[PDB]
Design a protein around this ligand. Structure first.
Ligand SMILES: O=C(O)C(=O)N[C@@H]1O[C@H](CO)[C@@H](O)[C@H](O)[C@H]1O
Ligand SMILES: O=C(O)C(=O)N[C@@H]1O[C@H](CO)[C@@H](O)[C@H](O)[C@H]1O
Ligand SMILES: *Cc1c(COP(=O)(O)O)cnc(C)c1O
Ligand SMILES: *Cc1c(COP(=O)(O)O)cnc(C)c1O
Lengths: 810, 810
């Protein structure tokens, strides 16, 4: 139908149909009379999958022959989403499959909606890993994503009585056609035990063993015939395990629980033993695999030349002492040599500065679970501090501040300090975040080793976040500048010469309108809920957290409602405010915020006087697949975290690439986005990081804002009196109390400027032509935010490898 | 190579090779450079599997169109063994696959050894179900095997220090290419809850729900293009289950444990709650499936005309009250009508008379787990006893003897009584067993309803137990009488006219010698253990149990050893005594018997004076696949259970069909086997059932035999003094104490006649020609023991359906 979806050749379409019927028959064991839409989805998935295998096998054979430096991206999260459409896009099979299924009397879009999201992530951090895998494959890097194959990913969110309810994400229920179990490469992982010091070296003995079974999933590059691998480990109990008989067999569950479920926390550290087991499990199995592959290429001096390990935050930080353990205890290398290798091999990426998110494991936990690693960590700390003492003689406080071991109630190991000490590179994920790291939390480390600190601003893949979710926009763009931008997003700047092009302006606006109509329809289809497609789509989708300030958005919504009620017959730009996102199960305040949003909707959406001028909808079960639907339909992107809290943000980039304007604070990547597009094409408001610090030095007193702002006072009084919760008048007391007495994120401080800024947004929306022209200026300068650019920087500046856009023979 | 393995056509072999390479590439994602023997096995399994699907789909479509009466065989055990070779045999693809793999440079036999046994059974009972499925498909019956898909089947047995060690049978580790998950047909199963009595009818509410997910495995008939289904249920927790968050997800294990492991008991009842859950789980899911299928064909009067449910022992006995529950509580039929339907639909097969094997569930268990079913059982009992009271007025003891409810310490429900009351047919599995049922344990029931009692002598499938495991024998037989006997075993009688044929005599003996050489080689390959192929192969393989009397065999072995030591230079027919079988993990005496056997081997196998004249080997991990190897190599079959204890036995039939002579008691099917072949061609010895009863009335005193038999006394003294356990002199005290003071199976009573009979066996073995002629007389009359004959009788006399040997168009 459209050009960027490839050719629908005669032979290819015929071949696809035959293979589709072949799988339906031989693979699913069904015939057209009893086949269901799900059967058809699988028939198509297997058919598309077949096209991947050939490239997958030769890509891997290729790396074996050429033996390039391997990149290992370790993460406990890979937020992949669906795989069918992404695979067709990267293999240029979309139109062909669309035609083939059409001729078979099937609607491919309907079939795509059947696939379960691979939700092995919580949010930004896990999605980043997914975008990175796509970019690494597209840039021809010999990269491997290593993680855990959770039986249950992020929970499915149900809203009941306005409250969030969690239910198990049994994503493997119907099977996963994309993965390939590789039981032949199963590896043992050790836990507990004790350390024995013999004549030559220490030995970790009397351990409990859990097997790590790998499952491989193909990661196709964009039209370059490269197919990399994402290897996820699954926990398996050994067969002699616990070997009454029946109970012993049933207790195998204990060991296999390690890969059972993803911890649902976003930017929050929960020091549970099970989580520590998952972290070591992925690290231990992965490192053995890495070393095995290295040996089949004794000379560990060249290890750093053939291996790069990227730690996605501190979750896989045990890779440092585990690598030391293997080199020292098993390979028998001297400490200093092993340490040299480890440092040159490992690199660490920090994704947050919030104190509650930093991993600080109790020593008693490591002591019992990983006795040898604790000893290695102490030795690392001893040697590191000796270096600090030599560089800053007499500075005893620096010593205690930089120690990997924190003293106090219970001794803990600061995993971030461990990562900096054992990595040759440490990076932040946005310019402002990386600067904050050097000026605050990692200042001491930066002064000791300035060369280690870098910045690698985040990005998103333009394949999934443009071509796949917004084909209409990708098409009108391709019509003017070709398709080269899909793997070279910087080319979007050429669109600047069309900012005054009446035809283009009209097409950009038309695509957005179509996306909104499609989404407005979807809302009634799967959720029965009416909305006005002509209104401004104001959306804030991301995990629910106090720092992201969904509450500030709520205050604005209530302000709009109160203004309408005050002057009913006054004209106001119609808005549909959409807020979505999951709250961690144990995060009470976050759950209360969700309830508040639905409560506001209950009042606003049924007030006759408001009419279709204002609607407040809470988007249930926000996930990757839902993001692909709502982002292309958005007009306004809410990125309003308190300055200095959102390390980077990536949703912000997705909105910018898809034609939405941004209202936000100078936080994370928002700063660079505004810099790229020009501040006059961005809706910036609120305190800058410096203003927040000034307020903290002086002391934040929310009461002051409450006393000086009548509209704000009115909102708080409405919340307190039960205006939004008639049957339960004090339902939101916790929220009001927090806002008034212990709001770490200064919601009130940015309220006035936020509301004012929102007024300017509505003013511009009233002028369709100028709004669209500003949109074009944003889309045109979003090129820097492609993860291809991010990965190219990691490749050259950290891993020491050159990216390549060379096609492999298919 | 040989004729009964089909044709190796040019086009077919070429097609097989291509498809083999296709699966290796697309399905396993490997190429000839990294493929392992296991990869090749799977490539072949998928290739053969492809040939099944077409027939599987049309067979099922066929039953839908013609709508014949459906046969549902409910069993908690299906001891299937391997599936690859069996599938090739039934599809006439063996030679073609042999050639195709040959041309690909692969040894098919080597690949077949890679497949894991589907050990979802303990022994005879589970294997019978497997043979039955094969026969039902071969006879064109619309039959379905329904059971549980245990994650872990019968444990793998390891022998350490002469002791049995158990290890989990993780048979699904590498995947199962034969099954097809059918998540779309998942059904809910209820547990616990309580009963509510409303205006119209009772309601079972507040129940805990477990989902039953079916996995279908194809069951091919022998060359008739019929492919039936074996549907096994897997337990799955609902997603709202238990819905801290993490713990709730982990606790899903509780519900899914239902299908985790097979209880490893043979002829022994263990009243554990988990076992009861498994029993109801299979019954509840199966009945819903049955009714669903029936409705898609309101008129339950015709239910018995379209449905037959066969209960494999009492394990699935809850089908009776469950069917009543559904008809009365859900369909709203009046009791009497529902009962009429239930009785005409259900039939029960008893497999044992041992008291410790009978299922007697504590009322408190049913009360808590299945409250509605207990009420239904009480009502059934009330009405049944009213019938008994009317037929035998004033006979109050009969009432208490026949009650489904047993009074005493704890009230229990006699499931066997429940089955007889709710079934229109009750059968034993061998003529003598069925007679014992009418004369003893079920005498009262037989007097009340004589018409219900029948006999259906067991059988074994000649496909797996002849053509598959002994192609050499199948070939020489086919050479003389054709291939028709494979699905009409009675034709083997034609071999009687070859009993004097010198050529045939020579071939029969040659095949046996080849099988022995092959097995003798296997023993050194996988177990490193030397044996003499020229010796008489004396084997007893079956589950270890006191009633099977492996101990009597041990006494004979020790007797042989003592006789040799007494007169070293006297000639004796060389023997290799092989004993194998698993012991239930909690069956202490059985485990002690295994230790005794290995202990005897330790002494006998290393005594220089004995030389290669006597060897005692314990066959480790006896399973279906091992049975296929050792049975064709056997000369003497040990079937020595105490008269009246082995209901039928089936291993006995396998040995007879494969050219081994039988030494045994007049127990189970041994009686009919001797009757068929002629007593002069069988080695019968010991007490008959009547002799056992006489001994019991008089009182069994083992001391008497010990005092009158010097050789026996010597053996007991050797055991007691530590002759077979130097380091642990009293190691076998429990065994001696049991034999001397509480031997329920009168081992000593049959010792003298057994040893005497064994002497006649050795005498005949010394005359190769006459031994073989007797073998021919056995093989020639083994036709009655084909499970095709057994199933044909079940079909006509119980299910009311006619078997058919008509091919379906392929
Ligand atoms: O640490 C977390 O839980 C987490 O999701 N951190 C997230 O990582 C993303 C990728 O770098 C950043 O863009 C987000 O600003 C940060 O909060
Ligand atoms: O009940 C058991 O555990 C069991 O295996 N019973 C077995 O069933 C077989 C099939 O009918 C019979 O041939 C055996 O004699 C009987 O012990
Ligand atoms: C991109 C994405 C995120 C991250 O969004 P931010 O607004 O940067 O926090 C979270 N969840 C999903 C499903 C995403 O697609
Ligand atoms: C046939 C068979 C049995 C039953 O043997 P019996 O001697 O009748 O008890 C038990 N186990 C296996 C593996 C079998 O093949």
């Amino acid at each position: 139908q459209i050009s960027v979806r490839g050719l629908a050749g005669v032979e290819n379409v015929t071949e696809l149909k035959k293979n589709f019927n072949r799988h339906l028959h031989f693979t699913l064991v069904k015939d057209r009379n009893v086949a269901t839409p799900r059967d058809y989805y699988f028939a198509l998935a297997h058919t598309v999958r077949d096209h991947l295998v050939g490239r997958w096998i030769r890509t891997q054979q290729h790396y074996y022959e050429k033996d390039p430096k391997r990149i290992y991206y370790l993460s406990l999260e890979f937020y992949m989403g669906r795989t069918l459409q992404n695979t067709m896009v990267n293999l240029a099979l979309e139109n062909a499959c669309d035609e083939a299924t059409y001729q078979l009397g099937l609607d491919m879009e309907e079939l795509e909606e059947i696939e379960e999201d691979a939700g092995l992530g919580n949010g930004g951090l896990g999605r980043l890993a997914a975008c990175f895998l796509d970019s690494m494959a597209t840039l021809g890097l010999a990269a491997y994503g290593y993680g855990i194959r959770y039986e249950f990913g992020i929970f499915n969110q149900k809203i009941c009585g306005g409250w969030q309810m969690e239910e198990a994400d049994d994503w493997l229920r119907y099977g996963n056609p994309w993965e390939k179990a590789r039981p032949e490469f199963t590896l043992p992982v050790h836990f507990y035990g004790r350390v024995e010091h013999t004549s030559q070296g220490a030995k970790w003995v009397d351990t409990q063993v859990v097997l790590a079974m790998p499952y491989d999933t193909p990661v196709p590059g964009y039209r370059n015939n490269v197919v990399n691998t994402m290897r996820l480990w699954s926990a398996k109990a050994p067969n002699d395990f616990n070997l009454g008989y029946i109970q012993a067999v049933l207790d195998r569950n204990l060991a296999e629980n390690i890969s059972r479920v993803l911890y649902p926390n976003d930017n929050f550290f929960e020091g549970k033993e099970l989580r520590l087991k998952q972290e070591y499990f992925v690290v231990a199995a992965t490192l053995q695999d890495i070393i095995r592959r290295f040996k089949s290429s004794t000379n560990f001096d060249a290890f750093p030349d053939k291996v790069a390990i990227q730690l996605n935050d501190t979750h896989p930080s045990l890779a440092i002492p585990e690598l030391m353990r293997v080199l020292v205890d098993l390979e028998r290398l001297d400490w200093d040599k092993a340490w040299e290798v480890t440092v040159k091999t490992c690199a660490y990426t920090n994704h947050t500065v919030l104190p509650e998110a930093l991993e600080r494991w109790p020593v008693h936990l490591l002591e019992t679970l990983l006795p040898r690693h604790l000893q290695i960590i102490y030795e690392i700390n001893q040697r590191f501090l000796n270096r600090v003492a030599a560089a800053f003689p007499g500075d005893v406080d620096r010593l205690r501040r930089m120690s990997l071991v924190e003293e106090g109630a219970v001794k803990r190991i600061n995993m971030a300090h461990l990562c900096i000490a054992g990595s040759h590179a440490v990076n932040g994920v946005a310019r402002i975040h990386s600067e904050i790291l050097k000026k605050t939390i990692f200042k001491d480390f930066y002064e000791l080793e300035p060369h280690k600190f870098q910045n690698k601003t985040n990005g998103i893949t333009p394949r999934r976040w443009l071509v796949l979710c917004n084909p209409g926009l990708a098409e009108i763009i391709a019509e003017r500048i070709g398709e080269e931008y899909i793997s070279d997003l910087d080319q979007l700047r050429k669109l600047l010469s069309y900012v005054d092009d009446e035809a283009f302006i009209r097409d950009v606006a038309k695509v957005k309108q179509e996306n909104k109509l499609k989404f407005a329809a979807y809302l009634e289809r799967e959720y029965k809920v009416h909305i006005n497609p002509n209104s401004l789509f104001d959306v804030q989708v991301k995990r629910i957290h106090e720092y992201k300030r969904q509450l500030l958005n709520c205050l604005h919504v209530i302000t709009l409602y109160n203004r309408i009620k005050k002057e009913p017959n006054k004209f106001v730009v119609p808005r549909t405010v959409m807020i979505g996102g999951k709250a961690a199960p144990g995060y009470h305040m976050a759950k209360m915020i969700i309830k508040l949003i639905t409560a506001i909707g209950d009042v606003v959406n049924h007030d006759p006087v408001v009419g279709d001028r204002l609607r407040v909808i809470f988007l249930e079960n926000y996930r990757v697949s839902l993001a692909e639907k709502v982002i292309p339909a958005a007009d306004l992107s809410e990125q309003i975290s308190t300055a200095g809290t959102e390390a980077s943000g990536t949703g912000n980039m997705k909105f910018m690439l898809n034609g939405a304007l941004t209202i936000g604070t100078m936080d994370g990547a928002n700063v660079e986005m505004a810099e790229e597009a020009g501040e006059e094409n961005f809706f910036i408001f609120g305190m800058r990081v410096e203003d927040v610090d000034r307020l903290d030095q002086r002391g934040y007193n929310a009461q002051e804002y409450y006393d000086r702002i009548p509209e704000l006072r009115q909102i708080i009084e409405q919340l307190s009196s039960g205006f939004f919760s008639p049957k339960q008048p004090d339902l939101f007391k916790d929220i009001v109390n927090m806002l008034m007495h212990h709001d770490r994120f200064k919601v009130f401080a940015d309220y006035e400027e936020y509301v004012k800024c929102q007024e300017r947004v509505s003013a511009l929306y009233k002028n369709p032509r100028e709004w669209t022209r500003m949109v074009i200026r944003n889309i045109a300068t979003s090129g820097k935010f492609s993860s291809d650019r991010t990965i190219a920087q990691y490749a050259r500046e950290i891993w020491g490898v050159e990216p390549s856009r060379q096609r492999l023979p298919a």
